């Protein structure tokens, strides 16, 4: 478990630097918003990976670090959805909520596994906003009659329901 705890540094160190290369190149007139979203999806995936390694080793210095990254990634995701919702890019908004819903499960998968109920409600708080937000977006997509984006909105409403069941069981 010595090198296994050490091997986590290479990914976390490279990712924290890789987040900056995309966080500074996206403020200039160059990079689009959607490329940063995939990085957020990459961040929550690392948070989930750190959670799966921390269960075997039981290192609380890594479960909390996965949650710190997960909460920071989910919080940034909600803002990007809010920013895109006024501009009319519905594909980007639904891509952001999918990131938020998945990030809630990582927070749940951690509180229930660790036992700390301090954040077990906070996963629901993120997930509750997504189900309400996508439902409002689904009706607008249903009203506009744009089926390609509307069909994708249904996938989020279904995938959000899977998270709600997992936080109770």
């Amino acid at each position: 478990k010595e090198k296994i705890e050490k091997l986590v540094e290479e990914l976390i160190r490279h990712t924290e630097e890789l987040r900056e290369l995309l966080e500074k190149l996206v403020k200039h007139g160059g990079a689009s918003e959607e490329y940063l979203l995939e990085l957020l999806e990459n961040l929550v995936r690392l948070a989930h990976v750190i959670a799966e390694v921390a269960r075997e080793q039981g290192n609380e210095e890594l479960l909390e670090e996965a949650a710190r990254l997960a909460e920071e990634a989910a919080r940034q995701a909600e803002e990007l959805a809010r920013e895109a919702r006024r501009e009319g890019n519905l594909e980007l908004a639904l891509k952001a909520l999918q990131i938020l819903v998945n990030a809630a499960y990582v927070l749940a998968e951690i509180a229930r596994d660790r036992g700390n109920e301090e954040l077990l409600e906070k996963a629901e708080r993120l997930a509750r906003e997504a189900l309400r937000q996508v439902r409002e977006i689904s009706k607008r997509l249903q009203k506009e009659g744009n089926i390609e984006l509307a069909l994708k909105a249904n996938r989020l409403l279904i995938d959000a329901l899977r998270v709600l069941v997992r936080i109770m069981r």
Copy 2:
């Protein structure tokens, strides 16, 4: 909770899309993508019916309705020559079999396990028959992707065979 609103509302998206595919309004693939969402909802309901039978029966009625629509639509695309849509539609039946098995095998309905097992074998046979044609027609891109379906279809039989 919310599952009542979604099952009705998602079925409502099925009704608007079932008439636009019949009339000229909808390309078949857009109707196909909804089926993938339909089978996905049934599995979510199945995990809810365990942790929380009236929902298990609703998931099987809803899931089976997606599998039946897939086999019939697959036959139409198989006869028309559009093989890519036929292989994509046939996958929906394979995907629907796991939802039906996990819902029959965990509900004791032994007869429903016979219908779940039957669909994947026929789908695997149809996809195997579709796989052979793609090798002869020289279409390599669709043939290997069709092979991935036959491999992933075989996985369904093992999950329904080991648990028997």
Copy 3:
């Protein structure tokens, strides 16, 4: 004879995939990689079938399919890294990294510390190769592939932790 009719269906898949292996190796580029991704999935499926029926010969066939994919994948990764085709190189390591999990899922259930020792080398070497391309891609002003290279390094670290 439960696993008797299943072992017949699995024989067809190993033969049909090996038959498709000759057609895709004879035309020669990325489509050959797609065969590896489709092939390694069969190795994991056959391994889960051999653990269920206890057939050791199916383990030998499952390891044969898995092991040849890692050798075929690593060579293209070295070739694709030098040709500038970095997207093709990243796909080869992704196929290479995923194939290592099949060896672990096999070795521990088969009990072979020689094959289990070699798997760790494959995932660790690939992770550094994915890391080395990530650093080189970071120097190139292309962020998009760096995102995909970064995702592999995350999944490469995930596989290495379980194989230990």
